Ligand SMILES: O=C(Nc1cncc2ccccc12)[C@@H]1CCOc2ccc(Cl)cc21
């Protein structure tokens with residue numbers, strides 16, 4: 001028992017981290033097979049980050065201008081290309097530590113582990129969620145660009161995020177491994193509206209099921225609700241509307257606890273309307289939305 | 305910016321994880337050099353876990369009875385010995401992936417990352433603290449025994465914890481890498497008093513400094529306090545008494561923010577006396593005590 005904000009083991013990803021330097025800028029790259037993937041703003045100076053013309057900037061760069069270091073050894077760059085907001089630097093050596101991998105675009109409300117890196121060196125790992133407004137609430141400093149988000153299914157690493165930018169609001173924005181930004185964000189140092197975020201309802205419900213499984217049951221009540229009634233409450237409290245698809249993915253947790261999904265919704269409804277009244281759930285004094293039903297199942301079952 | 309419950313990258317530790325089987329019991333082991341370290345209750349059946357005589361049980365076991373599997377390959381056991389509550393199984397092959405390491409006994413209130421493992425396979429990593437009562441609030445299921453806690457200083461891994469037992473209260477108990485239990489816990493299936501836990505005051509203060517650094521400053525007030533006055537409040541709220549040593553380790557954070565340690569204490573005092581009033585600090589609706597001043601410095605500076 002016990003419930004933690006657990007990340008996937010980061011080893012498979014540490015083996016792919018490299019340092020990419022171009023001019024005066026240094027950031028992290030992801031070496032998979034004979035390709036190193038990094039944010040394309042590695043080619044910019046601070047001056048041209050106000051409105052960079054990336055295609056023009058890249059034209060002033062040759063293969064020898066991208067300095068790729070894997071630990072202490074230099075990789076020989078034999079090709080470069082820009083795909084959306086990422087650069088793909090073809091090297092002459094395949095990464096001997098390339099794990100089985102996929103490049104996947106995650107859905108908002110899904111979770112992933114981030115391996116925060118500086119100068120191609122890993123500093124830590126943490127679990128986070130793609131917010132409904134496509135930002136992530138990460139922990140990133142200058143130099144962390146190129147750090148990646150991922151999920152792991154047994155031996156396969158699904159890369160889903162690459163860090164690029166910190167918004168003036170302190171929240172983070174990035175791309176999938178094809179360089180497409182999640183959200184409306186552009187790689188320019190300009191004010192950008194993140195947009196109204198919402199609470200991931202299905203995740204709060206999944207975490208309520210994890211609380212019941214791990215002992216915390218004070219919030220369970222004698223009530224039930226309907227999807228319509230629940231959604232009126234979710235509307236008022238800026239929670240994502242609950243659909244039959246969400247109820248279906250909560251099936252395994254509903255079957256594990258014997259608490260019908262609509263009964264758990266009525267518990268969430270009372271919690272939203274009355275608050276915690278100074279109590280806690282799984283050591284938290286607020287409703288946690290960064291655990292999917294899949295995460296709750298995985299953590300409470302022990303999948304490796 | 306942003307502040308997360310970050311764990312150290314787990315790669316160096318994944319490379320040491322093995323499966324240890326003895327009789328019907330299977331748990332995790334830690335392979336460092338030519339030695340595999342695991343909890344000694346690997347030799348017990350459920351029956352004798354009520355009051356095991358480990359010395360007698362171990363006598364019925366030969367080197368061939370300890371089945372050690374590193375991934376898919378079997379390790380040849382050439383020696384076995386019990387040291388307090390751990391078994392040291394000498395193998396004929398040094399772990400090619402043994403990182404630079406140390407075995408350290410951590411102090412209560414210090415933090416470490418746990419690599420939760422099942423059948424010698426890693427499932428996830430999370431950060432936690434040794435509570436003042438020597439328990440850890442982890443996330444562990446049956447089979448997780450042998451999972452280890454650690455800290456990493458650049459290339460050196462300081463192993464500090466090995467998981468052994470879950471108390472009926474849902475909290476976890478374990479040993480250092482010399483098999484000595486943290487706390488009064490014994491490896492027997494019997495009721496064991498964890499004891500009154502307290503809030504790690506120096507850590508809450510360090511996390512308040514991290515909140516100021518990362519933008520959250522609503523809790524800062526026009527007041528100051530003395531160590532004596534603060535400790536009267538800390539007493540009432542079951543917080544560890546603050547000493548000059550704690551104030552000294554908070555020096556770097558005090559210098560970073562320009563907020564004197566006793567001024568930050570007065571902010572904590574007001575928070576303890578008035579509560580959060582429905583507000584949050586670094587996304588939390590409660591006072592967080594699982595980040596040391598060193599953790600706050602490391603995360604806010606970017607140490608790899
Ligand atoms: O945000 C950026 N990097 C960082 C990322 N995460 C945390 C940071 C903390 C402190 C300083 C920088 C941080 C860079 C530099 C600023 O201007 C831009 C503009 C656009 C893009 Cl795509 C990237 C960047």
Ligand SMILES: O=C(Nc1cncc2ccccc12)[C@@H]1CCOc2ccc(Cl)cc21
Nearest residue numbers: 001345353444445446468469470491492493
């Ligand atoms: O606690 C133990 N193992 C586990 C550890 N962490 C989480 C668990 C969750 C579910 C079941 C077992 C769990 C074992 C089995 C119970 O009896 C004892 C008694 C003493 C000792 Cl040292 C170990 C053990």
